[PDB]
């Protein structure tokens, strides 16, 4: 496994190179939003982002070392968290707005076009504000996103046996990413005390991201039953994995 032998700088480079592209929406800017239109645009975008996410995961060091079943499990658990942290990152320099795509920049009030959406918008906007307040760096962002992939479902398997090799390996890779974060902070000139404080601040945001994903999954589930929008088979499978 190359993963455990990578240096801090090598980890960052791998993660920066693995980054998925920023997609555009098919959004026609000349036509007003309806609840159906907006949800159609957002679900369409989520579906396309998911396909790129799957390729990105394969490039996260240590991920392909896992069984196909464990890979599926991690992605099923973390997919909406991963979409969300990406969205929050994109929107960081757009106070009060969410940059779903360069041509789909929605502000706080437009979440109202969809039932129960505004509450989620608000949580996402508060996260981007936090990122802005901390001056989150792109190198830290990619580390945080990989941590979400490896961490979120890691306790929902290791479950023996004897696939404790899976769990221990994942935790070793997680330690390497922690090392990478601290390396970036030291390189940025933070004192030891400031490094530890900032690490904790960053990781505590992951708790809020988990919360948002769970609320998001309930919203998506209610959108399915309200048949407000037809959902792709991939999206439906990722949703069903959370068996709400």
């Amino acid at each position: 496994s190359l993963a455990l032998s990578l240096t801090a700088d090598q980890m960052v480079s791998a993660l920066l190179d693995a980054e998925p592209p920023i997609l555009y929406s098919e959004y026609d800017p000349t036509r007003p939003f309806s609840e159906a239109s907006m949800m159609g645009l957002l679900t369409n975008l989520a579906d396309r982002e998911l396909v790129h996410m799957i390729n990105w995961a394969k490039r996260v060091p240590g991920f392909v070392d896992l069984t196909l079943h464990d890979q599926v499990h991690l992605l099923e658990c973390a997919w909406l968290e991963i979409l969300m942290i990406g969205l929050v990152w994109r929107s960081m320099e757009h106070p009060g707005k969410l940059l779903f795509a360069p041509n789909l920049l929605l502000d706080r009030n437009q979440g109202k076009c969809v039932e129960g959406m505004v509450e989620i918008f608000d949580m996402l906007l508060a996260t981007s504000s936090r990122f802005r307040m901390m001056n989150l760096q792109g190198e830290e962002f990619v580390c945080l996103k990989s941590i979400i992939l490896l961490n979120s479902g890691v306790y929902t398997f290791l479950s023996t046996l004897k696939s404790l090799e899976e769990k221990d390996h994942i935790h070793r890779v997680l330690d390497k990413i922690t090392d990478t974060l601290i390396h970036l902070m030291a390189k940025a000139g933070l004192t030891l005390q400031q490094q530890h404080q900032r690490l904790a601040q960053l990781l505590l945001i992951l708790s809020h991201i988990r919360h948002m994903s769970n609320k998001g999954m309930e919203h998506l589930y209610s959108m399915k039953c309200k048949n407000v929008v037809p959902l792709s088979d991939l999206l439906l499978e990722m949703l069903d994995a959370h068996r709400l």
């Binding site: 799957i54 995961a57 890979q71 599926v72 992605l75 099923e76 499978e237």
Partner: peptide, 9 residues
């Protein structure tokens, strides 16, 4: 599953 198929492509 679709995800299972994409992880093999």
């Amino acid at each position: 599953k679709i995800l299972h198929r994409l992880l093999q492509e």
